[PDB]
Design a protein around this nucleic acid. Structure first.
Ligand SMILES: [Mg+2]
Ligand SMILES: [Zn+2]
Ligand SMILES: [Zn+2]
Ligand SMILES: [Zn+2]
Lengths: 1473, 244, 63, 126, 76
DNA sequence: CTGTCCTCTGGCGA
DNA sequence: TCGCCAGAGGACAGCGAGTCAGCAA
RNA sequence: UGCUGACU
């Protein structure tokens, strides 16, 4: 009978220090805690009043033993006051900014009172009052602010419960942080100008006031006690009614002894790290208590008192935080280390507890148990026990279990009594078990702990759990004589199990209410589709794909007896007749087709009442794989009308198609995906099981699959071409490298080696990667030439009869990159995206000359695994295989950390009954889940391209799922009228960006006015002479209430999902779905007309069908979609050119939210006008940066009289694409470089111990060092300068300075843009597009070219710059597009409904907030936010603020032992009386 | 495992009369699925099979030294000539019968002799089942080892993947009713877990801070939460909890 | 003085005769260092072409 | 690999020691295998492998073993667990509480020990 | 009165679990069981017959609730 | 290692 | 003449799961 | 409790 009482809220505050007393059984005084023999020494840390530490003893405080005694608290009473280590830093500030003389803070009372009032208003939730108070102040003190603040707090009370929400915690956080950060600095005192008694704290345990005295915690305590008195009204709000006394400790609390368990350490049998810290405090207390007595029996004595004080504080520091004090040793870890880390106490024993009734063993392939079952090896089954209650309808089978005993299988290990408990049957006398088989049904009934009984439900987990499908429920099929847990191969891809030693865990629910959820929710057939993109997860693999593709091929004929025994061996049917087919060939010999075997297996599995399905699709095996012989042309034959590439199932009977991986597989829209749509998830599991069994029987009985050497071999007469191509490839190095260094086209054979060496020993190393790339391209051309010679038709056996092809080609295993690289080429090795690295001497391998041009020396392997690879290629291949292994390990850590961050933030985002995705705070991240309700799993066939399938299967889809009844109970008038209104509006307004307005609509008289009326005036008030006539005619010279130009100019009706509640309102769908339905109805009523097949469906029954199928795919309330978004962004990354890629970019976007990204960019289309195309050339040449260093030949420095001649470059080769002129360049030196030069000369010397004339004169007017430069009337011939510092300066090779400065000196550049470039083509549809990409980011510096470039369509990857020029609703879409383009480079595709939620959460509160440790500060849950990271900072915060927790997060709900507030726990049950 | 990195567990012990027998009377003793080759490209196993079959046939002993067989002199050519010199076929395929239906399979199978090693990892050393047993005495949770009985750790990844199913009661079972579950009782008015104290024997828990015994009520709470409240009190922090 | 070493653990290890190929590989092992097992960047794991004939490309633990 | 680890049993007193009963020498092996005689210590057995998809239980890295081959001694093995019982434990520097020995007639060790408190050599333990 | 009329899958799961935990504690079965020993099969048999006197109390994010009958709820 | 966060930190016209 | 735009370094805190063993302090 | 190995 449980306590029955639940928790609503947990608040963290500070204990009085006077109420801790009476929370204390006794004061401990004896240092030595371990007795001579290992027992507790009286009055020591381990005592018998602080509780029995072990079961041996009984506590003195309450007589009770271990395992039944809640421990008790005790206190080491300290000799003198010490500061508390957590409230210490704040104390320091409370003493830094304050007058020790006046005892008042040095802050202007304006700030004090403003912040006081803002806190008073925040305490009730009022959030506009904050800025209203601040503006009332600035426009104007206590009476001015307190009136408004009291009016708010009074008129807006009843909101103390509705104040623990994000956006109310962020504001208070920011206010108090800004206060502590900006207004607590040491300042001259207001009232007495000399009140800076500068407290300045050294390392912790040390505060020093000046006239350099040592602040004694008693003097600091009195200072705080007298400062509170003057400034309490203000600080009681900055700290909650905090007493200043809490900032100081007069005793330390020793926790109960049951929580401090003695283990062992080197040379010590009984020691806990926590007692070793508390023992150090007790030992210092004893030394200090002696010195005080020495003073009583009475500078060294008091210097010793001040030194032992500093020592004692650090032990209490160390007792609180092992690493607060770094100069002490024998320091075991404090409480900050007991709580805050991955080892910790939250990420272990709090979120990751260890569980009973669970097994773990190696998993083995089964395949002869149904896909929803696990095989249990009779050793778990005899130990795993379910505790079932005894009732009239089970007392018979329970009686057999208690009789069978603890060791026979349908048995039981124990039986729990009504009031007593735990009478174990494990005896093997077989008579007392019978003595107790009676007395069952002889209050709460006896419960028999029965064993696993062949129908039980078990949760199975594989340990890298990266998605929801990694935990699924299975149905306990008991197997005898094994120690392995057997699992079907359809459930492999879901877990990623591989049967190579693959331990897996099995959990056994014990509640009968978690069994209901394992059956209904966690079942393994509700898990058919991955939640990432809704595509199927379960499917057949390997030889069930090569078996089904070779049986469903056109030339497979079976006699009656192989037809049968192949149907019954796939079925193994249990009920009802087997419905057979008719022979396809009836005459020369009755024969079947193999497609008929699959057909007849398909019409028996589909449920009896339901009718077989129709299906049309494509096969994975291309119809070109079968073309042996050159194809000829027949005039009326569309070869694809009758091809093995088109799968056509017509009423459950396969009529055409091979049925490879595209069906039976993990590919969407196949046969099993449609089975799962029309008939449910159990029928798709049945289909998978039966098809696996059939395709196994086929290969095991009549056919066989193998992979010899005559299917990897290559024809002769085809290896001769391969050999000649490999011979040709050994001559392509010189040309490649040369034409990449832009060297003279020929005549240089040794200048090229020297240029390569220079590029290799260079500093930048980007003229070396150029050679690497332009060499890889040549080698890749050659490699592609070789594959074509051998792989398609140079093989000895072709695809229908090749075993390697037909394994990579039907999706069984491998890719076309594996088939090659086994035959005819291994390829070009690439380690870091580059060729193998060279040695320090210029050779890549000891076998190769230095700087060798042959591609072989750069990792181009022309050998194959058929005929092995020579010793050097084996080494290069080994460097690449090792790069892969080293790399996979690093990636797992990077991805796993990112999932934890997203998971910790998005965990409480659950769909609610109103259909809104809301956080646990009640905060609304989304008003519909992905902009339209709709769960990513159920939206797969709601895609135009599938109405064709739903139409074909109308009768089953309506009968089996929707029902004709739901159409009967569903009414669409409210929603249908809304769409009619929308359609009419959009009919009257084709261009929806045309500035509709009443008055604007009353500009059709424009000609009426411009004709003669307004011809006489000027711009009276800036508007116009002719605009005033329109204003006069409209204003009051129009009808009173019949001037209705308004209706012709009114807004579009708002979308239906917005007004008409998509769940309870029929026909209320999304504006993009109804368009698709209209298009398809129009393209389907014009197909029925020319169909030669009778269709008994009408466009207006298909419409209702689609509307019901939409209304039903609507994201059940309680879905917890934020966790699904987290896991869908995590799993693909965890598993898996001038921009960033991979997890670096994802971490830049999500976890960091940086304003500085490594590769910022832009892309504005070019306006498509003849003038714009001409102006853009100049624009590109205008924004590239030209730097003094990019235009210079060499300097000539002479040296205290230091001359300098710049000698600039000729215009032939830099004016072409930089838009510069020599007068501007030289003028730059006179005004910027020649004064930054003196700036740097002072930077060094501060810590060292007719017309030529006006230019020279003004220049030396401004500086006192220069003498005279030069002039160059002919293209900058000789332009030097002269300086001199005559007395004493450090004459060294100052060329260093004037060269380190002539690099970062840029003539002129647009701020933030480093280079532009016009990537000519970006489209094929409208190929005419041009894009001006950039590698910097300055949005406003492009606004000036709104006629050269399209400033709508401007894009940047920055997301902080977009959020500052266009707003936050425009940064949402940039975030979403960035995540999508990051995932796209790998072929991954996360559903948009997940990125929508992630972007809506990130940009919730007006700013692009990072999804990381600093984003949780604006979070309304202290118990969360401390289960993530920096748990001790978030605990100190929550403690000095009195922060309250509502126990609504998943973390706060799992910490205090509640039921999470999403999914199954979102409602009550309320049994009526 | 083989000598080429093809490790795998033993999944069945196939009866000797259900194995596909060859036309020579033989019957394999290892069955190796042919789908580990296409993605792993261990073409050395397909050559070791032929080399070992040729060795067992001719009483020889061939060497598998790397880099001894070129493109011109291939290994498959060499060992297929060896096989064809023994009456077998070049490509190393002998045709089997089905030991279950008795019919000659349509495909001729690739059979040979390869050298298997047995690895030191056995299910007998890696299998665990726990029902009830020992407990960490600081947190009162399963102990966490296999030599000791020990429980398996559920984990935060598993806790976050189990509440994406919407199963809050499977989570309640795993994390609460199986690992740690206590009945620590609190003073309802003071709202403190440390305050209720037993008496000296009508055994009434009496609140120490306020002397009332009508205000104490039992709450079902984890044990690590009581440990957490105790170690917070150690720091003078107070956890005030609202009972309903 | 750490002996001019830079490492203070894993200096001696158990030599286990599970096989004679586990044993013979303890007297030919060369450990780059025990501290490098804790590093973000992986550049002491690159198999440079200067260990040709001195270190085996293939024989390295694979975790 | 479970192989032949050494020739001197009865002497080692290790912790675990895996032994394969009837190792063979590879019929196909590199010549260096013969320079360092590695047949003094063999590591595996030759098996007749067929590369065939026949069972439905050998997919995804799993392998099938004939049952008669396994019953005729294919790849049988053993483990030697040597436990050093130093009985200076259970006591400190007092009187010798340590001598292996049986008080005469103990019903507990009626016939499982042999008068020096040590199991018989050859006895089976459970 | 404004929430969806159907019974979400989480509600079906929790109602089956609670009805099963009741049946197992010796509660009268109003469904005429026919030899099955599983309380969850019996709970499904009862849910299919529309005999479950439980009141789903759907909570809205502001504390307001709506009390639906398990009988007056469209089970898919 | 890498990022933010944090804490200063002296330097020209108002 | 020092407040705020700029400007610097210093400090901290995070670094995927879950398993099995031995040896030793 | 830590260091060494090891498994996916
Ligand atoms: Mg594996
Ligand atoms: Zn007690
Ligand atoms: Zn003052
Ligand atoms: Zn009380």
């Amino acid at each position: 009978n449980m306590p029955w009482r639940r928790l609503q809220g947990i608040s963290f505050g500070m204990y009085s220090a006077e109420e801790l007393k009476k929370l204390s059984v006794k004061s401990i005084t004896n240092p030595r805690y371990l007795d001579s023999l290992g027992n507790p020494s009286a009055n020591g840390l381990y005592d018998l009043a602080l509780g029995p530490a072990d079961s041996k003893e009984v506590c003195s405080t309450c007589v009770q033993d271990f395992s039944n005694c809640s421990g008790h608290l005790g206190h080491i009473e300290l000799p003198l006051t010490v500061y508390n280590p957590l409230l210490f830093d704040k104390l320091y500030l409370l003493l830094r900014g304050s007058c020790l003389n006046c005892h008042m803070l040095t802050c202007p009372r304006a700030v004090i009172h403003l912040l006081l009032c803002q806190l008073r208003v925040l305490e009730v939730g009022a959030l506009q009052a904050v800025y209203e108070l601040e503006r009332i102040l600035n426009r104007f003190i206590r009476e001015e602010l307190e009136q408004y603040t009291t009016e708010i707090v009074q008129n807006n009370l009843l909101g103390s419960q509705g104040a623990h929400v994000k956006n109310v915690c962020e504001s208070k956080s920011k206010l108090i942080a800004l206060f502590w950060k900006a207004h607590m600095n040491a300042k001259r005192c207001p009232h007495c100008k000399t009140g800076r008694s500068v407290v300045r704290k050294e390392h912790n345990s040390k505060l020093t006031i000046t006239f350099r005295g040592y602040l004694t915690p008693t003097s600091a305590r009195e200072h705080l006690s007298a400062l509170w008195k003057n400034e309490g009204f203000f600080l009681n709000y900055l700290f909650s009614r905090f007493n200043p006394s809490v900032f100081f400790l007069d005793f330390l609390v020793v926790p109960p002894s049951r929580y401090r368990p003695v283990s062992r350490l080197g040379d010590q049998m009984f020691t806990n790290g926590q007692t070793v810290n508390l023992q150090a405090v007790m030992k210092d207390v004893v030394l200090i208590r002696k010195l005080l007595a020495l003073m009583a029996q009475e500078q060294s004595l008091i210097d010793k008192l001040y030194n032992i004080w500093i020592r004692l504080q650090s032990h209490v520091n160390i007792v609180f935080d092992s690493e607060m004090d770094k100069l002490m040793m024998d320091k075991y870890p404090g409480i900050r280390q007991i709580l805050e880390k991955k080892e910790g106490l939250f990420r272990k024993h709090m979120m990751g507890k260890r569980v009973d009734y669970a097994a773990r063993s190696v998993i083995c392939p089964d395949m002869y148990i149904n896909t929803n079952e696990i095989g249990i090896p009779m050793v778990f089954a005899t130990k795993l026990t379910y505790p079932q209650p005894v009732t009239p309808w089970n007392v018979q089978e329970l009686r057999q279990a208690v009789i069978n005993g603890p060791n026979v299988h349908p048995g039981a290990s124990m039986v729990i009594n009504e009031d007593g408990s735990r009478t174990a049957l494990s005896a093997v006398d077989m008579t007392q078990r019978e003595a107790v088989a009676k007395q069952l049904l002889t209050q709460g009934t006896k419960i028999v702990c029965r064993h696993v009984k062949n129908g039980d439900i078990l949760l199975l987990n594989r340990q890298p759990t990266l998605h929801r499908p990694s935990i699924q429920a299975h149905r306990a099929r008991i197997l005898p004589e094994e120690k392995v847990l057997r699992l079907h191969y359809a459930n492999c891809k879901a877990y990623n199990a591989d049967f190579d030693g693959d331990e897996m865990n099995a959990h056994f629910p014990q509640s009968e209410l978690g069994r209901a959820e394992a059956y209904v929710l966690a079942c393994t057939d509700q898990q058919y589709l991955v939640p990432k993109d809704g595509q199927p997860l379960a499917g057949l693999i390997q030889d069930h794909m090569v078996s089904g593709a070779s049986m469903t091929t056109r030339g497979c004929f079976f006699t009656r007896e192989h037809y049968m025994e192949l149907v019954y061996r796939g079925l193994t049917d249990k009920v009802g007749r087997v419905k057979l087919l008719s022979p396809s060939i009836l005459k020369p010999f009755p024969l079947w087709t193999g497609k008929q075997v699959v057909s007849t297996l398909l019409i028996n599995i589909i449920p009896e009442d339901h009718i077989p399905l129709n299906l049309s699709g494509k096969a994975k095996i291309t119809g070109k794989a079968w073309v042996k012989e050159t194809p000829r042309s027949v005039p009326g034959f569309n070869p694809d009308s009758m091809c093995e590439s088109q799968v056509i199932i017509r009423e459950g009977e396969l009529l055409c198609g091979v049925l490879d991986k595209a069906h039976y597989g993990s590919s969407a829209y196949g046969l099993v995906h449609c089975c799962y749509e029309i008939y449910g998830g159990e029928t798709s599991g049945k289909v998978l099981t039966c098809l696996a069994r059939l395709f196994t029987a086929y290969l095991q009985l009549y056919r066989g699959f193998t992979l010899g050497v005559e299917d990897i071999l290559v024809k002769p007469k085809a290896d001769v071409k391969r050999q000649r191509i490999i011979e040709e490839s050994t001559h392509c190095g010189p040309q490649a490298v040369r034409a990449a260094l832009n060297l003279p086209e020929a005549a240089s054979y040794d200048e090229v080696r020297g240029k390569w060496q220079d590029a290799h020993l260079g500093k930048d190393q980007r003229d070396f990667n150029m050679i690497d790339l332009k060499f890889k391209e040549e080698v890749n051309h050659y490699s592609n030439e070789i594959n074509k010679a051998c792989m398609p038709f140079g093989l000895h056996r072709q695809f229908p009869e090749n075993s390697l092809q037909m394994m990579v080609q039907s999706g069984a295993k491998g890719s076309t990159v594996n088939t090659m690289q086994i035959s005819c080429l291994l390829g070009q090795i690439e380690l870091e995206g580059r060729r193998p690295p060279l040695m320090a001497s210029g050779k890549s391998l000891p076998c190769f000359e230095p700087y060798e041009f042959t591609p072989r020396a750069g990792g181009f392997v022309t050998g194959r695994f058929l005929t092995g690879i020579k010793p050097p290629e084996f080494f290069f291949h080994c460097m690449a295989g090792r790069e892969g292994l080293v790399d996979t390990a690093v990636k797992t850590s990077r991805s796993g950390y990112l999932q934890r961050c997203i998971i910790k933030h998005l965990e409480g985002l659950v769909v609610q009954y109103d259909l809104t995705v809301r956080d646990s705070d009640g905060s609304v991240v989304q008003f519909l889940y992905g902009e339209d309700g709709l769960d990513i799993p159920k939206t797969q066939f709601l895609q135009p391209k599938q109405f064709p399938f739903l139409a074909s299967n109308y009768e089953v889809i309506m009968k089996s799922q929707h029902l004709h009844e739901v159409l009967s109970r569903a009414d669409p008038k409210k929603a249908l009228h809304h769409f009619r209104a929308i359609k009419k509006w959009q009919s009257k307004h084709p261009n929806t960006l045309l500035r509709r307005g009443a008055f604007l609509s009353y500009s059709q008289k424009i000609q009426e006015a411009v004709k003669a009326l307004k011809l006489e005036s000027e711009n009276r008030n800036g508007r116009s002479p002719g605009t005033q006539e329109m204003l006069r005619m409209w204003y009051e010279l129009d009808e009173e209430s019949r001037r209705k130009y308004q209706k012709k100019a009114a807004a579009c009706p708002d979308p239906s999902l917005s007004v008409w509640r998509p769940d309870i309102y029929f026909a209320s769908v999304s504006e993009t779905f109804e368009t698709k339905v209209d298009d398809y109805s129009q393209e389907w009523a014009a197909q029925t007309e020319k169909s030669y097949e009778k269709s008994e469906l009408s466009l207006d029954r298909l419409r209702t069908l689609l509307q019901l199928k939409w209304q039903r795919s609507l994201c059940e309330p309680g879905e917890a979609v934020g966790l699904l978004a987290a896991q869908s962004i995590g799993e693909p990354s965890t598993q898996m050119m001038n921009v960033t890629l991979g997890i670096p970019r994802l971490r830049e976007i999500l976890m960091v939210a940086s304003a500085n990204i490594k590769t910022p960019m832009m892309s504005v289309p070019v306006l498509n006008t003849k003038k714009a195309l001409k102006r853009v050339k100049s624009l590109k040449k205008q924004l590239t940066r030209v730097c003094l260093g990019e235009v210079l030949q060499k300097i000539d420095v002479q040296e205290q009289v230091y001359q300098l001649r710049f000698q600039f470059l000729p215009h032939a080769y830099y004016q072409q694409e930089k838009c510069l002129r020599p007068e501007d360049i030289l003028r730059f030196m006179e005004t910027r470089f020649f004064k930054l030069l003196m700036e740097s000369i002072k930077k060094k010397n501060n810590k060292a111990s007719e017309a030529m004339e006006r230019r020279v004169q003004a220049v030396r007017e401004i500086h006192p060092f220069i003498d005279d430069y030069q002039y160059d009337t002919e293209e900058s011939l000789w332009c030097q300068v002269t300086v001199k510092l005559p007395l004493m300066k450090i004459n060294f090779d100052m060329s260093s300075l004037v060269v380190s400065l002539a690099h970062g000196a840029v003539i002129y550049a647009t701020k933030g843009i480093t280079r532009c470039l016009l990537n000519e083509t970006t489209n094929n549809k409208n190929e005419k597009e041009l894009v001006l990409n950039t590698e910097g980011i300055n949005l406003p510096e492009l606004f000036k070219y709104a006629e050269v470039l399209d400033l709508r369509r401007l894009y940047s990857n920055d997301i902080h710059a977009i959020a500052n020029t266009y707003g936050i609703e425009a940064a949402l879409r940039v975030i979403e597009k960035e995540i999508k383009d990051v995932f796209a480079v790998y072929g991954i595709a996360v559903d948009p409904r997940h990125l929508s939620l992630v972007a809506d959460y990130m940009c919730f509160e007006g700013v692009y907030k990072p999804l990381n440790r600093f984003g949780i500060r604006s979070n309304s849950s202290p118990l969360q936010q401390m289960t993530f990271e920096t748990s001790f900072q978030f605990l100190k915060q929550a403690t000095m603020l009195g922060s309250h927790d509502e126990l609504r997060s998943p973390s706060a709900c799992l910490v205090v032992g509640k039921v999470v507030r999403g999914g199954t726990g979102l409602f009550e049950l309320k049994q009526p009386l | 495992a083989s000598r080429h990195g093809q490790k795998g567990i033993l999944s069945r012990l196939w009866p000797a009369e259900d194995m596909p027998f060859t036309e020579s009377g033989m019957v394999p003793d290892i069955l190796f699925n042919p789908h580990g080759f296409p993605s792993r490209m261990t073409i050395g196993m397909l050559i070791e099979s032929m080399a070992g079959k040729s060795a067992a046939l001719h009483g020889l002993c061939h060497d598998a030294t790397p880099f001894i067989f070129s493109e011109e002199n291939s290994a498959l050519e060499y060992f297929g000539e060896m096989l064809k010199a023994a009456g077998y076929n070049f490509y190393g395929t002998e045709r089997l019968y089905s030991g279950i239906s008795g019919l000659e399979l349509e495909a001729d199978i690739f059979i040979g002799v390869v050298y298997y090693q047995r690895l030191r990892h056995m299910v007998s050393d890696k299998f665990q089942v726990r029902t009830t047993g020992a407990r960490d005495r600081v947190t009162n949770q399963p102990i966490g080892g296999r030599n000791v009985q020990g429980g398996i750790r559920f984990g935060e990844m598993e806790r976050d993947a189990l509440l994406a199913h919407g199963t809050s009661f499977l989570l309640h079972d795993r994390l609460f009713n199986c690992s740690d579950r206590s009945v620590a009782h609190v003073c309802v008015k003071c709202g403190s877990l440390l305050s209720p104290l037993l008496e000296k024997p009508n055994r009434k828990y009496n609140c120490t801070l306020c002397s009332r015994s009508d205000t104490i009520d039992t709450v079902s709470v984890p044990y690590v939460f009581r440990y957490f409240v105790a170690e917070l009190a150690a720091m003078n922090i107070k956890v005030k909890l609202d009972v309903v | 003085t750490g002996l001019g070493l830079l490492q203070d653990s894993g200096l001696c290890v158990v030599a286990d005769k599970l096989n004679f190929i586990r044993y013979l590989s303890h007297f030919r092992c060369v450990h780059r260092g025990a501290d490098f097992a804790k590093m973000r960047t992986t550049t002491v794991r690159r198999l440079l072409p200067e260990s040709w004939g001195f270190l085996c490309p293939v024989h390295t633990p694979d975790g | 690999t479970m192989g032949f680890p050494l020739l001197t049993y009865q002497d080692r007193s290790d912790n675990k020691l895996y032994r394969l009963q009837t190792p063979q020498s590879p019929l196909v092996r590199p010549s260096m295998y013969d320079y360092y005689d590695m047949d003094n210590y063999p590591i595996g057995t030759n098996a007749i492998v067929a590369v065939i998809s026949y069972t439905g239980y050998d997919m995804e890295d799993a392998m099938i073993v004939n049952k008669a081959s396994w019953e005729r001694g294919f790849a049988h093995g053993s483990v030697y667990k040597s436990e050093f019982i130093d009985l200076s434990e259970k006591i400190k520097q007092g009187d010798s509480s340590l001598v292996f020995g049986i008080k005469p007639g103990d019903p507990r060790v009626l016939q499982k020990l042999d008068d020096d408190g040590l199991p018989f050599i050859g006895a089976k333990l459970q | 009165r404004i929430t969806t009329p159907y019974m979400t899958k989480y509600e079906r799961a929790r109602v089956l679990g609670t009805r099963a935990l009741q049946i197992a504690m010796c509660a009268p079965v109003m469904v005429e069981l026919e030899g099955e020993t599983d309380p969850l099969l019996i709970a499904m048999k009862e849910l299919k017959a529309r005999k479950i006197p439980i009141i789903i109390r759907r909570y809205l994010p502001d504390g307001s609730y709506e009390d639906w009958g398990v009988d007056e709820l469209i089970i898919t």
